[PDB]
RNA sequence: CGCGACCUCAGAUCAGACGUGGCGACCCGCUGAAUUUAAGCAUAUUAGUCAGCGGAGGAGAAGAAACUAACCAGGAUUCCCUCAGUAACGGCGAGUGAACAGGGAAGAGCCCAGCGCCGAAUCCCCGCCCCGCGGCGGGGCGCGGGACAUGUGGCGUACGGAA
RNA sequence: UAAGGCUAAAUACCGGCACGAGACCGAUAGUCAACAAGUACCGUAAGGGAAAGUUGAAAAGAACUUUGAAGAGAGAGUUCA
RNA sequence: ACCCACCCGACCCGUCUUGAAACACGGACCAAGGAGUCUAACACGUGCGCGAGUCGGGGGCUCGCACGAAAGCCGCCGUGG
RNA sequence: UGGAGCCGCCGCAGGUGCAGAUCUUGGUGGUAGUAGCAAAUAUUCAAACGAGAACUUUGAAGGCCGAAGUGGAGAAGGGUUCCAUGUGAACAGCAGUUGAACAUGGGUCAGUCGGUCCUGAGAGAUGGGCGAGCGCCGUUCCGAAGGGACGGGCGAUGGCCUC
RNA sequence: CGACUCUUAGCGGUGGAUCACUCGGCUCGUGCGUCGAUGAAGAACGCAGCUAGCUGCGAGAAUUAAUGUGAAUUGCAGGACACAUUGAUCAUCGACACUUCGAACGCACUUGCGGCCCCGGGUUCCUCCCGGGGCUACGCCUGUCUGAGCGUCGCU
C-alpha cells in the first residue's frame, strides 16, 4: 500500500496527471530498460530514450532481433519513431510507426557529459541502497 | 439562425370575439 | 446532492389557457432550453424527488456490552475447525486451529 | 397599430456600450449603466442575482495581479534575492 | 426619532407596522456622530465622542480621532493597538463606547442576549440544530 | 504605408525621414476597417518614388 | 451608418476580424476535436445590438 | 547568430543602442519581406530578431534600474518602483522594531516577574 | 498707523503619509417585510427571517464583573453536552422559549484619566559621522525648528497606592 | 464598582490556493457547463441561457483503374475486423 | 412457439362516480427520466444486551490515520437523560 | 452481432420496477406527395458560356414605374453587406452558369464636408443641508467662489549682459 | 401469379436507446488563509511564419532574464545550436516589463480641449509650430510658507 497521504492513488487523477504531464514529466514516464550487458556494466535499471539511442524492439507485430536507432522521440503521443519500425502507405511512401517506449531495450546509450553524470549518480544511489540493505 | 420561439398566445377566445359563443 | 441543482433556472409555469401541462417552464429566450420544463423530478433537468442530506442519521452506535458480546463470539469461533472450513479457509495441512506461535 | 408598425418606427437607441463592464446597458439619457452603476463609485451588486454574481465574481477574467499575487505568496513574498548563478 | 422612509402612507401588509412616525432608530445619535465622523474621515480612527451641547434641533458631539500612520501614535507601545487593522471602522461595527451601548452587551440576568458574540451569535446557537453523527 | 492607430501626420512625416532620409510633401491618412492606420506619404517631386520602391524593397 | 465613432469602428474592426473561417491546417493536430467554427456570423442572423 | 544574455551584460549603453537599432532594421526588413513574400527562411527569422529585441531591452532595463538602487541604496527617500512592493497590509505592517516596542511598565514586569522553569513531583 | 504675540479660519502642483474600490463562505453595526400557520383573520407566527446599506479580519465579536447565587457559597470570555422543549411568553390558541448550577475543550492577564511626587525629566521633523540599509532602525554631534503647562513621560488603577 | 480602553486559545467558514477520500452520479444522470460554457443565442435593459464524449492498437483515414461535370458509385487496397 | 382457416365468446385502457364502451375526461407511436424519500418528536408491536438499574453523550488516552476520519479503553463508568 | 468486463449465494444499503399525469427530453408515422408556391397588366425570338438555359449575359420586339416614380442622393439603423476572381457542398420555400451564399484578395485619403466650440429644454458636480447608509436635495441657494492684466518700483539669469 | 392491405422472419435505411468506458461533477475532511493609488476586481483592444475560437501574454506583447532539468517543438516549412556547450524544450520564477478604460486621478468621456517646467527638431531663448519626458482627483494627518479677522492684549 501506499502511507503518505500526499500521494495522490486517485484513477482519474493519475491518469489527469498522465495525460496532462508537461514535457520534462513525460521524459521521466517515456524511459525503458537496458540490455543484460549495459546494467551489468553500469548497474542502472532504466533511463530515458534520447535522439539516437539504439533499440531491439521486444513486444508487438514488429517483434525481432534487429537493433535500430531511434529516429526521433515524439513526446505528445508517448512514443518513439525508431529507423526500420516504418511501413508502407497506400501511396508507397513509409511512414515510422511508432513504438511505446515500455516496449522497448537499449542497446547502445549515446553518451554525453549528461549522461554519464546521470549514470553515475543512479549507479551511487544504487550503492547506497545496497549498503543500507545489506 | 436561432431556435425559433414558442408560438404566442393568440387571445383569440373570450368575451371580445363574437365568431363562437356558449349560452350565457 | 447539491440544493442549488435544480433551482438556479427561474422558471415561472405557463398556466391554463394553451396546450402545455401546467410545468415550470424557462421564461423568455431563443434558446433550445426556452419554455422547456424545469423544477420538478419528471423534467430533464432540474431537481430529483428527496435531494439526499448531509444530515442523514449514516452513523449506528452498538451497546458496549454487545460489542464485546459479538467480539467473544467471534473469537470463539476463531477456533472449532468446522466454522472456519465452512468460511472458507484451506485448512488441511494446519497441525492445530488455536495455532499459537513463539514470541519470536 | 401597437406591433408590426410599432416596431417598424424603432430607429434611435438607449443603451450603448459601456466603459467599465464593457455591455451594452449605458443609457444614453440617464447617464447610468444598470449593469455596474458607471457614474456610481461602486459595482452595482446584488444577493437576488447569484447566477449574475457569478457572471463576474473574480474567478472570471484575466486574473493578471491576482494569480501571480497567489504565486508570490506560495513563493513567500520575498524581494530582491537572485538564485545562486553557475 | 426616526421616521420610516417609505411613501406617502403605504406600509403594506399587517397593521402591526404601519406607524412610520413614532417608531425609534435602535442606535444612538452620539453613535450616529462618531458614525458620521468615521465616515467623513475613514482614514482616522475613532477612539471615543462625548456631548458639548444641545438644541432643541441639534446634538453637539465631540469625536476624538486618531491618527494611524503618525509616529508619536505608531511607536509608542500603549496605542500601537489602534494601528493594528483589526480596528479599522470601530464607529461602523459599533466598537466605541457610543456605538458599544446601543448593542445590549453585558454581563448578568438583565441582557441574556450577546451571551456569546452578539445578538446574532446567541440566535444563531439558539437557532441552530446540532445534529451528532451517532445522534 | 501601414502604420499603428496611435499616430500624428507629424509623426509618420517625420518616421518616413529619420527612416529612409527622404523629405516628404505630405501625410495623408486614414483607418481600415481592421485596426491599422494607412498613410499615402506624398513625397517631394525632386524625388522618386519607384526608385525608393526599389530601395525599399517592393515592387 | 457612415457616421461612426472610434470605439465603434474598433469594435466593428474586431468583428470582422472574427467572422474568418478555420485554416485547413488546425484539423491534422494531434488533440483536435473542432470541426468547424460554431461562431460564423453572418449580417442578418445576429444583428449586434449596440 | 544568437544574441545571448551573458555577453550583453558587460557592453557599453550606446553600443546597445546601436546593436537594437540594427535590429530594428533587421526587423523591419523582416516585415517588408514577410509583405513582398520572400521565402520561410525569411518568414521564420522574425521570431528570433523580436526575441533578440527582448533580451536586448531586458538586459538595458536590469542595467538601468540596478544603476537607479545604487544611487537610491543609503537615502531615506527612494522612489516608489524602488520601494518594496510585497501586499498592501502587509507594506502597511509595523516597522519590526515598533513591534519589539516594550513600555517601562512592561519591560519591569519581565524584569522582576519572569516566567521560570519547573517541574513537580519529587 | 503700524509693529509684535496668542486665538479662530483659509490658500497651496508646499515636504512627507493615509483612505476611496473589489471579494464577501464565516463575522460585526443597522434596516427589514410578505408568502405560510392559526384549517378564516387582525395580536401572534413565519421573523430580527429574505431582500437592502456600510465595515474589516484570518477569523470577527465577546472578555477580565456596576456577575451568578442565597449555598459549608462559586468566580473573565468563548464553544460542546446537560439543565430543557423546562421556568416563562402566547386571541394562554396556533405556537414561541432562555438562564443558573454541573461535566468537559481552552485558560492570561492587564493598561488609562482622576488622586498625587519628580526642574517637560516627554514626543515629532530636518543638517553631519558610524552599522546593514529589499517590512528606514540604534548611538552621538546642532542657543537647529516644532508640539506640549488648555499637561508629555516615570511610579501608580481598586487585587489598594504613594512618601 | 457602571457611565474609559487592550488582549491570544478553545470557535465559525457553500469565497480563494494547495490537497486527500467516497456503500455518490455516470452524458436526458452528476454543477448551467466532462466538449472552443456563463459559449453560441434571445430581450432596449435588468436578465434568461442551451445542445454537443466515444474511428482504430497504430491513420495504417481507402494509392491506383473505370462511369458521371461533380456529389455519388464498381473494382483494388489497409486493418483481426 | 410463426402464419392462416372454422365455432363460440368478446365494446378502449386509467380516473371522478350510485352508475363508463360512452355523445364524460387524458391518450398518434416509440426510447430514456419520472412521483410516499430524509431528520426530529412520539405511540404501539418485534429482535438483542444488561437489569433497579441502563446508556456513555460530550471529552480524554492509544497509531504514525492504506484499510480510519474505523476500532479499543476510561478512580471522567456516571456530570447528565 | 459484439469486443471487455461480469455473475450465483449469505448479509447491508438505496436516487430500485411505468401505460397514462392537456407528464419532461429526443426521434418518427397517418394526414400527405395533400393545403399551398394566385396582391401591384407581360412577356417573346436568335446567339454566347456550359455536361446542363424559362429565369445568366448580349441583340431585337412588345410592356410597366410615369419626374408626390419601380429614378438619382442623404439621416437613424446595418457593418463589409461595396468591388474583382473562382465554386455551385448548404441557403435564395422551382431551378440557376446567377446572388446581398461560400473561398481568396482589394477598397473608405480633408485647414475648407461634418464632429470637435457654444448654448437651449434639461442634466450634473464644490460649498451648504439631509440621511443609519449606498447616497440624496439644490444650481446661487446657510460661500474667503479672481491665480488675470495695464502703469511703476526692487531683485535675477539667458542671448554680441547696450536692449 | 395480379395491384393494394395485415402479420411474421432475413437483410438494408431513419434514429440514437441499452451496455461498457470517463483528463467531469457532487459531498465530506485537512493545511494555508494572500487583493488594491508602488494602481484591485472587471472590461476593451492588440500579440503566432501560416491563427478563427479556447488558453496564454502585453508595443520586450504564444512571452524577456535567472535557476532547476537535460535533446527537443510539431499540423507543415524554416533556421539556429556542435546536446564535450549558461544548452533546444518544459517547470520554478526571486530580476525586468506590463497598451487603454476602470476606486481611475488635469475637465468631461467625443479619445476632444488644456495649463507648469525640461530636452530634441524650428532656432542658436526670440516668440510660433512638432515630438518626447515629469506633474495637475477628492477628503484628511504632522510640519513649512503666505495670509484674514470693528476675536484678546503691550509701544505710540
Ligand atoms: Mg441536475
Ligand atoms: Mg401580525
Ligand atoms: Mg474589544
Ligand atoms: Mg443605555
Ligand atoms: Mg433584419
Ligand atoms: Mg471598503
Ligand atoms: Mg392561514
Ligand atoms: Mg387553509
Ligand atoms: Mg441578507
Ligand atoms: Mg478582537
Ligand atoms: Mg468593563
Ligand atoms: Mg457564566
Ligand atoms: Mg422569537
Ligand atoms: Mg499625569
Ligand atoms: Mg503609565
Ligand atoms: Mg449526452
Ligand atoms: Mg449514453
Ligand atoms: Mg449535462
Ligand atoms: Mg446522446
Ligand atoms: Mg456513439
Ligand atoms: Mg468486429
Ligand atoms: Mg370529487
Ligand atoms: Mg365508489
Ligand atoms: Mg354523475
Ligand atoms: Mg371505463
Ligand atoms: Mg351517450
Ligand atoms: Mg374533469
Ligand atoms: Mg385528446
Ligand atoms: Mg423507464
Ligand atoms: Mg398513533
Ligand atoms: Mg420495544
Ligand atoms: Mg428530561
Ligand atoms: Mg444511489
Ligand atoms: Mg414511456
Ligand atoms: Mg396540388
Ligand atoms: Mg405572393
Ligand atoms: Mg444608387
Ligand atoms: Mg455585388
Ligand atoms: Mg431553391
Ligand atoms: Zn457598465
Known sequence: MKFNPFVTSDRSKNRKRHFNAPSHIRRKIMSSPLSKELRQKYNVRSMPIRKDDEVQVVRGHYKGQQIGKVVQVYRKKYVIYIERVQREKANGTTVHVGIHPSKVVITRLKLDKDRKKILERKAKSRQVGKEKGK | ?24 | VSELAGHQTSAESWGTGRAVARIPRVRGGGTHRSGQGAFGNMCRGGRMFAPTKTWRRWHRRVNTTQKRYAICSALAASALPALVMSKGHRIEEVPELPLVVEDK | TKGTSSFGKRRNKTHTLCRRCGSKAYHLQKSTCGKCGYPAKRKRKYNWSAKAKRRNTTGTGRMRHLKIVYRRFRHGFREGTTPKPK | ?135 | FIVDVKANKHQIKQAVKKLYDIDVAKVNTLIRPDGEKKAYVRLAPDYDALDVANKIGII | ?50 | ?122
Open chain 8, 1 to 122: 547568430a544568437k544574441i545571448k544574455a551573458r555577453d550583453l551584460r558587460g557592453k557599453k549603453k550606446e553600443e546597445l543602442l546601436k546593436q537594437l537599432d540594427d535590429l530594428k532594421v533587421e526587423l523591419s526588413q523582416l516585415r517588408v519581406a514577410k509583405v513582398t513574400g520572400g521565402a520561410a527562411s525569411k518568414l521564420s527569422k522574425i521570431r528570433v530578431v523580436r526575441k533578440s529585441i527582448a533580451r536586448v531591452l531586458t538586459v538595458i532595463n536590469q542595467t538601468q534600474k540596478e544603476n537607479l538602487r545604487k544611487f537610491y541604496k543609503g537615502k531615506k527617500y527612494k522612489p516608489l518602483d524602488l520601494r518594496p512592493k510585497k501586499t498592501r497590509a502587509m507594506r502597511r505592517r509595523l516597522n519590526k522594531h515598533e513591534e519589539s516596542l516594550k513600555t517601562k511598565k512592561q519591560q519591569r514586569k519581565e524584569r522582576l516577574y519572569p516566567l521560570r522553569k519547573y517541574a513537580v513531583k519529587a
Open chain 7, 1 to 50: 451608418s457612415s457616421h461612426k465613432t472610434f470605439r465603434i469602428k474598433r469594435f466593428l474592426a474586431k468583428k470582422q476580424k472574427q467572422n474568418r473561417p478555420i485554416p485547413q491546417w488546425i484539423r491534422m493536430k494531434t488533440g483536435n476535436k473542432i470541426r468547424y467554427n460554431s461562431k460564423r456570423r453572418h449580417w442578418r442572423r445576429t444583428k449586434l445590438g449596440l
Open chain 2, 1 to 24: 439562425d436561432p431556435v425559433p420561439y414558442q408560438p404566442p398566445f393568440l387571445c383569440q377566445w373570450g368575451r371580445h370575439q363574437p365568431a363562437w359563443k356558449p349560452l350565457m
Open chain 5, 1 to 135: 426619532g426616526r421616521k420610516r422612509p417609505v411613501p406617502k402612507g403605504a406600509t403594506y401588509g399587517k397593521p402591526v407596522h404601519h406607524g412610520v412616525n413614532q417608531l425609534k432608530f435602535a442606535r444612538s445619535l452620539q453613535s450616529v456622530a462618531e458614525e458620521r465622523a468615521g465616515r467623513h474621515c475613514g482614514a482616522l480612527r475613532v477612539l471615543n465622542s462625548y456631548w458639548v451641547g444641545e438644541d432643541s434641533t441639534y446634538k453637539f458631539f465631540e469625536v476624538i480621532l486618531i491618527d494611524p500612520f503618525h509616529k508619536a501614535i505608531r511607536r509608542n507601545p500603549d496605542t500601537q493597538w489602534i494601528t493594528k487593522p483589526v480596528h479599522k471602522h470601530r464607529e461602523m461595527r459599533g466598537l466605541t463606547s457610543a456605538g458599544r451601548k446601543s448593542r445590549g452587551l453585558g454581563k448578568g440576568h438583565k441582557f441574556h442576549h450577546t451571551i456569546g458574540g452578539s445578538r446574532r451569535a446567541a440566535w444563531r446557537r439558539r437557532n441552530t440544530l446540532q445534529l451528532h453523527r451517532y445522534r
